[PDB]
Design a binder for this molecule. Structure first.
Ligand SMILES: Nc1nc(Nc2ccc(S(N)(=O)=O)cc2)nn1C(=S)Nc1c(F)cccc1F
Lengths: 279, 325
């Protein structure tokens, strides 16, 4: 029933994070990202994969990538999603750094997405420059693949865990409780990344890092940056989860309000990248 | 806003929905009041502004809902509603559901009236645009001990085997989810069913163990095992583990295309070959094959080690097989 191989055509390979594929809905000629999951391998049951799907279908924010259903071919399950043209924010970075204004514009958008998710008692659990995507016209939205309901543990045993601890909050690392306020902390780290091009301690060894995050003082923006940027970051990267603002509260923080510009003006970066990159 | 805003809602905006052509009046404006007043619910029904779901506000509210079949023709048509409105309706249903007096809910007491409130939901499974919402609400009420007994015994219960075999995965998944949550949720209430409806049920269930569809085949085979070792279902298993029809089929699932499928069959296979009081049809078919089953169980997924309990059962099965008679 409904063979997805002839329903869709796989093109290039896109994102690693596996096997996602740029592809075309052969019927409507509309471009999509297709994640192809093994099920014969899995082996985190199917009830987790079916669970990861049920959550996605619940999401309908235009700040999070739209889920377009899934199809089964033998033992392989194609999950189909709203394809974003511009690519990752981490990719866009490759053509040179960002305006404190472009940065702010993004964060405002991410924040809008994060509110939606937080309102619906969901977390994202994987906020990095890499999972922030742009459209051809510069709309900023969250790769929905992170998304998860509050309860019954994210990481467990495969295609759920985070490989890198860099953006991880300290109450996550210490295994203790942790809710939507650990999302905020990543947004903090994401900001520093968007500013500097990589999260604090990229030079370091992941095991070492993981033990430092809770022991140390939080990271902080360093350099040629408006005091309200630096302040915005310290709002996020407070080590006590409750001392961190909600999403909405941050949407009103001076750094955003002073600095965010029209979301269309982001097509600057898509047009730069485009100009910069061969092939 | 009070009960004086549920009236100006359900009578005016709601009842009007099922009537419209393609007007500019009910294009968005009239459907907006429908959607806006559902958000007004979740405000008083759930977290009031900053604070918690009020106990003050419910008293003079929950009763005004049962006034007429107001949630009858509400469910008797969706799609035309809203995406985030459907989401509210779901949670609006699912938060007053637990409104309780003493240790019994006034919801259950005044759902059990004209019970066709639930027949609508299961039937929502064929409308792909709502199917998921219906299941979401449905599971939340078959969650209650007295509530699920209503559906279990239905005639249109046996519609599931067509629902589960629906093409669109996510619906064919969510179908099996309500399927399970009934035959499990209440262990005492469930055992009541399988005995009085063994013949019709397991002939229908056997259809599943054939269908492939990798997932439908798997989940069903797995759900089989759970239902047998339930121990509230000791009567049912001794019954099922007796027909040689069932054991014949298991044997072939072990020869399956799929690794995970084979192993998932070995979990119903062992149950047959472990029964203290094995009946004659089983013992006959086992002896008949005995010679070359040892040949199969010698090299059966020899890598999972790892699983002693697997291998401890492995040798145990070859004892039974080699020893009879
Ligand atoms: N929905 C969506 N659209 C896109 N567009 C995209 C992403 C990367 C690139 S790339 N890295 O420039 O080739 C090009 C287009 N990526 N994408 C998703 S789902 N992002 C994603 C993901 F969700 C998981 C792992 C890796 C990823 F890149």
């Amino acid at each position: 029933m409904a063979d997805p191989e002839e329903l869709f055509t796989k093109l290039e390979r896109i994102g690693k994070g596996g096997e996602v594929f740029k592809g075309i809905d052969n019927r409507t000629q509309q471009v999509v990202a297709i994640k192809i999951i093994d099920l014969e391998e899995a082996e985190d049951e199917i009830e987790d994969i079916q669970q990861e799907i049920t959550v996605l279908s619940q999401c309908d924010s235009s700040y999070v990538t739209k889920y377009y259903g899934s199809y089964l071919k033998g033992s392989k399950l194609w999950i189909i999603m709203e394809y974003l043209g511009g690519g990752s924010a981490l990719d866009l970075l490759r053509a040179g750094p960002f305006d404190e204004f472009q940065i702010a514009t993004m964060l405002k958008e991410i924040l809008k997405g994060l509110d939606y998710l937080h309102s619906e008692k969901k977390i994202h659990r994987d906020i990095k420059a890499a999972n922030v995507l742009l459209s051809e016209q510069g709309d900023v939205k969250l790769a929905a693949f992170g998304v998860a309901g509050q309860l019954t543990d994210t990481q467990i045993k495969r295609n759920t865990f985070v490989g890198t601890p860099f953006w991880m909050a300290p109450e996550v690392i210490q295994q203790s409780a942790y809710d939507s306020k650990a999302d905020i902390w990543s947004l903090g780290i994401t900001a520093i990344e968007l500013a500097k091009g990589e999260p604090p301690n990229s030079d370091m060894h992941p095991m070492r890092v993981l033990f430092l995050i809770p022991k140390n003082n939080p990271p902080t923006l360093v350099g040629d940056f408006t005091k309200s940027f630096k302040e915005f970051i310290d709002a996020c990267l407070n080590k006590d989860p409750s001392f961190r603002p909600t999403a909405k509260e941050l949407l009103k923080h001076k750094f955003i309000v002073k600095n965010s510009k029209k979301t269309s003006y982001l097509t600057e970066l898509i047009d730069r990248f485009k100009r910069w990159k061969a092939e | 806003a009070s009960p004086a805003d549920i009236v100006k809602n359900l009578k005016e905006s709601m009842a009007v929905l099922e009537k419209q052509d393609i007007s500019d009046k009910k294009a968005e404006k009239a459907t907006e009041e429908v959607s806006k007043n559902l958000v007004a619910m979740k405000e008083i029904l759930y977290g009031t502004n900053e604070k918690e779901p009020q106990t003050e506000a419910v008293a003079q509210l929950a009763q005004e809902l049962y006034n007429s079949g107001l949630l009858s023709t509400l469910v008797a048509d969706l799609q035309l509603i809203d995406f985030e409105g459907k989401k509210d309706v779901a949670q609006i249903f699912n938060n007053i559901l637990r409104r309780q007096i003493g240790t019994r809910t006034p919801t259950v007491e005044y759902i059990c009236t004209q019970q066709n409130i639930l027949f609508m939901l299961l039937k929502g499974y064929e409308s792909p645009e709502i199917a998921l919402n219906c299941g979401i609400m449905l599971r939340e009420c078959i969650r209650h001990e007295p509530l699920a007994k209503i559906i279990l015994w239905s005639e249109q219960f046996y519609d599931f085997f067509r629902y589960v075999e629906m093409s669109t995965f996510d619906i064919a998944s969510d179908a099996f989810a309500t399927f399970k949550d009934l035959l499990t949720r209440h262990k005492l209430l469930s055992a009541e069913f399988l005995e009085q409806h063994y013949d019709r049920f397991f002939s229908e269930y056997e259809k599943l163990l054939h269908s492939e569809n990798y997932v439908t085949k798997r989940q069903s085979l797995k759900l089989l095992g759970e239902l047998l070792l339930d121990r509230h279902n000791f009567t049912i298993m001794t019954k099922y583990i007796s027909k040689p029809e069932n054991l014949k089929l298991m044997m072939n699932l072990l020869r399956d295309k799929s690794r995970n499928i084979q192993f998932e069959a070995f979990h119903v296979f062992k149950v047959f070959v472990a029964n203290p009081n094995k009946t004659q049809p089983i013992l006959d078919i086992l002896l008949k094959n005995q010679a070359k089953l040892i040949e199969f169980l010698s090299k059966f997924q020899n890598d999972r080690t790892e699983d002693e309990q697997f291998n401890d059962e492995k040798t145990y099965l070859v004892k039974q097989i080699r020893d009879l008679k």
